[model samples]
Target: SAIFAERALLPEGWARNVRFEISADGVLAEIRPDANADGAERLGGAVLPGMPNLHSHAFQRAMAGLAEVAGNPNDSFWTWRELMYRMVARLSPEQIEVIACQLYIEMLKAGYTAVAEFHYVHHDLDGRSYADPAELSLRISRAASAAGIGLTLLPVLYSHAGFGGQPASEGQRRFINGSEAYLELLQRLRAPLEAAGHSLGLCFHSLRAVTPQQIATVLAAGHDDLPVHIHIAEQQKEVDDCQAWSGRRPLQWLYENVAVDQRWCLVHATHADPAEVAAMARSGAVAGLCLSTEANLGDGIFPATDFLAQGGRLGIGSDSHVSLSVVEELRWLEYGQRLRDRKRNRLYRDDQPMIGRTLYDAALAGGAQALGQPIGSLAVGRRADLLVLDGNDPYLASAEGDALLNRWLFAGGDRQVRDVMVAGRWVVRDGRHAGEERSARAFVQVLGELL
Candidate 1:
């Protein structure tokens, strides 16, 4: 890290005349402003905290464009899921690691320094456990380590196929795991990740997949401090069935039943009522929003405006890998709210000058919480994850203060991300990852084999 700029955005908000220095061992050493001289880095433009991608299915990057074809009478997310299941059926752990390394590299180039991989694809083609119980999970860890991205490995506990304890369909074989196996798998998965500078978390696939009893069993077997994540109320039909089965909507049921707290991330709570939104906000848990993928899949917009109004915390994710731009996700997050309510500055606060600052600040705070890491900021004692924008670009030429951030999020294209650093190490430069060509070749080869 280098000493730069008067105003630097850290975890505790922007500080003037800030000086950032990294230790020889790569930890952030200090952050203090120069007392004299107009604050400026000897380098190019300003530094902003690198974004955290809170939700990802890395293998889905390979299947990105393959699911766009018309399949059913009405093509929807449900229909798209069938194609996803088919894709999962063919993926081996080796292929998954290859795709994941490529995807993580892409994420790094796009200014995402950390990711919460909501990984659930486990088991062999025949739905049997490997000799090493955490074989697939370790593959993900290896990808993250190789890509040099901060990893929050979320091993998902998937059980049933539908609401009301329905038997899992054949296509779900790769994701199916009972409570007994899941507990054992989680324990086995933890050590390798801890050894690799990664954090481990838990994810219940969704309300449709895990029963209350099963969820309890999984929780009872885990460390109390571990971050827990789950998918909730992503679809209309799922909500209807949850109501049918329990006389309550999915969020409502979970709130009343489960111990909802700060250590949890509820992914894709797209279908929720005013009560649900308020409850989620008050619960202090993070709402994992995947704006672009939700739009791409025709999943309804999350009640972000209402959630933000109720003081909710949120983090953005590239769920389906249909797109990988962190700027795009933040742009669409606010834009989607504006599009829905016909109102502007949907995520801005009174003191927040730019919508980008509002969204970026919120995402950084909430994403750090969700990922179970002390990241999302360029501060001492925190992981030095940061991005430098190319000031030469026309869109950013007049950029200053938070206005630069607004332009970065709204108008700055993907190429504007000139450099990205994670944990005080540069992983991307000149608008590309350090290993772009090699990763691209691997991805192309693997994709050709599958497609």
Candidate 2:
């Protein structure tokens, strides 16, 4: 697959008349800038590397605004979970398939080529085991394969309810799986997912949901080399609860207990203290930030300033799918810092004033590491995932050189994204996905009766 573009964002910087050769296995064969056209397919507009969503629950895309109605006097993440649990009860396997297909299409349209699905819903509505333990897992895998999106399917292990080995609640039944059952689920999913051209990984729902012993058991039972993901310190109460339980904060406790390294992705370490921040930075685990979802659920911000200063790796995700745009997630990350610190462009580390470029590059590299995918760039041996912004869009008229990125990132929801290519194929063309209509039709019918 030989393609050319007017201008493309390269590893070093922007270049003119770029040529890309996509390999047969859907990875990049070669990328050469400032080259002749050679009658290649010219993708008009500025090209960018497609982003990876580091953490997501694809089923929750159906419940985007369902939890927004205020009812509790002192509402927080707990209140949202109450409504989420109610909605989760009514979702069957077929419903989950439709919702996930729709969500994956939307993610691709939003410039995300790959996803790390933090899947937790596993059992039937009555909390009984299906004939196959990997029933719902296969649904998500099939949905991603149909949607033409790269997927890292993480089957989550949820055993307990809260701190210590507490009994799970009635609402938490669907997610319960002991180490023995969880290992069986992983085994059942591994071959099918690999056959679909996707990767399988281990996901712990959270520290509260899994005990230290269970974590060790799961990792020892053939999850050592695979990617591991878990939620930690998303709320102040979680931080407080974790400290009260073990005399240590969540991240700090995790670092000491688990063999955390670069293969780990700790999602939403929002309440990490200074010591926890340093611990996370030193652990080499990716601090997965879902800025839009954190704001929607009223979760506190991560210590990005200190974490980044400590040379920690950061990746952004639209965790809850409340806001799906890659630009919103990355933009709000910097904008949150500005509002809190009362300074503009506070994410600056160098003198380029290219915060857009900086954020985009960081997300691409960090997200790829988290997903364990051979993607996140246009270089050789990486997946051919790239995007073409609408050059005719007036908002990008004067964006020259480095200003190209500056204009695109700050210009939120301006409809600058036009075409999207994933794994050497054009999934979204002229600002629409090939399967969008069919997926949307199925989604409306499913959501109509459910809503």
Candidate 3:
């Protein structure tokens, strides 16, 4: 299928009268700038590569604001964990699928064309093993397929409750998977996920939940080519605990132990020294920053400016799903740095003075690497995952080139996102996904039954 865009952001830069030929399998077979329409499906608005949300816990989307009450003056991430535990105990597998479907739709409508689901919940609510270990994992992929969004399903391996392989807490039972069991689950998932046009990856919930040997064991198994993600140093308590257990900070310990390279995404390395930051940058791992959730949970800001200066790779995610908008994630990402440094335009290079364009380009490159997918750019051979922003929208009407991106990232938000395409198919048309109503209704029904 051929499509013509009045204006499109190509891999090099923005271009007008851009024509695209998308393959049936969703790859961009050919792209030509300064070309005539030739009866192609015309896009009147600015077209940009879709954002990849590099981290997500789909179940967390259902309980977005449920933990806001601060009964204790010292309410923090730990207190919120109790709320999450209670919430997870009540969700049936059926409800999990519905919630994920609705959440995926919301993500698509908000310009996140792909997601790296850092999923952990595995067993039943009562901690009973399922007949099929991939039961919930399959459900999650189905939801992503139904919503027509690209998915990189990361079945998280969580074993212990603390840093040193402690016994699984009651709340942690559903997440526990021994090394052998975890590898088997991934093996079981590979064909089905591939059949569904989705990708699969590896994840350790965090250093605290898995031992160094466990991490080593899993990586030693086949599937070294797959992307690996893990949470590290998101909270100060986690840093303190890692030091007490291993006599080193979480990032420092992981760097010393694991082969932390390009295939790894260290989610939320928010607490790091100059040494750790420089090492991670050199190792080519992406720092998966969830700025909105970090702020919501009172997690300290990551040293993003310092990291970027060292040629570090980074991408954004809506962790915990407090907000699903990619705009909010990137907006808060830059804003957090500005607020912390008492400086403006903190995320750009000296050559790239336009902050939003730098942020958008860096995210596109780093996010594609993090997902281990051929997405996050409008280019031949890349996935045809693109967004069309409404030219008539107030914030975007008069903008062009980098000014358009600046307005969209800083002011327009998702309001101007008129259409979305994934894998050469229009999942969202005219700001609406085809399954939005049904998914939203099912989501409400499940929430009513559970809440």
Candidate 4:
């Protein structure tokens, strides 16, 4: 596959008349900046490395605004879970596949070329395995393959309802699995996912849902090399409860119990103290930030300034599928910090003066690491996952050089994302995906039936 662009953001900086050579296996065999087209297909736009969504629950995309009816006097994340549980309790395998296909299409159109699905809905309505324990997981894989998005399928283990060895709640039945069962799920998925050109990883729903013993058990079964992800300290009550149950904070306990490293993606470390943030940065684990869902759920701001100051890796995700735009996630990520300290351009550094490009680059690298994939850059040996922005759009036509990224991140929307390519495949072109209409129809049908 050969692609030529008017202007592209390479690893060095902005380049003119860039040409790309993508191999049959989807890797970028060579990238030539300041080169002529040489009969390559012309992509008339400003090209960028496509963003990766680090945390997502594909099933939750359907119930995005369904939980917005404020009935509780003190509505919080816990209160929001009730409505989510209601949807989780009844979704069939076919419905899940439909929803995932729809969500993946939306993501591709919105500039995300890849996703790390933090999947947990495993069992049937009666909380029993569906003949094949990996049935739902396979459906998710099918959806990703159909949608043409690079997938890093994370099979989550949810056993307990809260800290300690407490039993799971009725609402969590579909998500629960014992250590042996969870390992079996991973075993069944590893080879199939690898064969399908998708990545596989381990996910513990949260500290409250899985004990130290269980986590140790799963890793000891020769699964320690895979990337690990877990939700941690998104709420004050969770921090308080975790402290009460154990002698340490969630991240602290995790560091002590497990060998926290770059392979770990700690989602929603929102309530961490300075010490926790520093330690997490030192550990090289990526902080998976979900800005839209956090704000919607009233989750507190993460200590991003401190974390970055200590040299942390951070990436963006649309957790709960409340927001699918990569622009919104990155914009809110910086805006949250600006609102916190009453300052401007807080996420940039002396070396990286442009805030927009800086944020994009950081998220690209960190998100790629979180997904355990060779993507997030337009370089040789990396996957050809890239986005072409509408260079003729009013907001971007007048911009030049680094200012293009600045405008895109702060002043533009998904409409600016005109084209998307995942692993050398043109999944979206001229702001349209081929399967959008069909997937939208199936999604509406399923949503109508579920509601």
Clashing pairs for model 3 are none
- Per-residue lDDT tens digits for candidate 2, residues 1-451, read 7999878888777888899998877888888888988978988788988999999998788999778786968888898998889888899899999999999999988899999999999999999989997899999999999988999999999999999989999999999999999999998887998899998789999999999999998888966667899998999899899989999889889988888899999999998888888888897889899999999999977888788778788898888899889889888999998888888876655545578887888888889989999887778888898888888877676677667777888874536788888888899898888898899999999999689
Per-residue lDDT of candidate 4, residues 1-451 (tens digit): 8999888888988898998999999899989988989889999689999999999999999998888887978889888988899999999999999999999999999999999999999999999888999999999999999999999999999999899979999999999899989999998898889888999999999999998999888877897668899999999888888889987888888887898899999999999888899889999999999999999999989988788878899999988998999999999999999999999988886688899988998999899999999988898999999999997897788898789999989998899999999989999999899999999999999999999
- Segments of candidate 2 deviating more than 4 angstroms: none
Model 2 lDDT-worst window of ten? 345-354
Tens digits of lDDT, candidate 1, 59-136: 999998778788677999888988888899999888999999999999998988899999898899998888886888
RMSD of 1: 2.0
Q: Write down the TM-score of every candidate.
A: 0.96, 0.98, 0.99, 0.99
List model 3 lDDT by residue over 1-451, tens digit each.
9999989999888898999999999999999999999979998599999999999999898899988997799999998999999888888999999999999999999999999999998999888879997899999999999999999999999999998899999998899899999999999999999999899899999998999899989999989879999999999999999999989999999999887999999999999999999999999999999988999999999999999999999998988998988788888899999999999989998678998899989888778888889998888899999999997786687888999999999987777888999999999999999898898899999889978
**Between the candidate structures 2 and 4, which one is better when assessed by TM-score?**
4
Q: Of 1 and 4, which scores higher on lDDT?
A: 4
Cα RMSD to native, each candidate?
2.0, 1.3, 0.9, 0.9
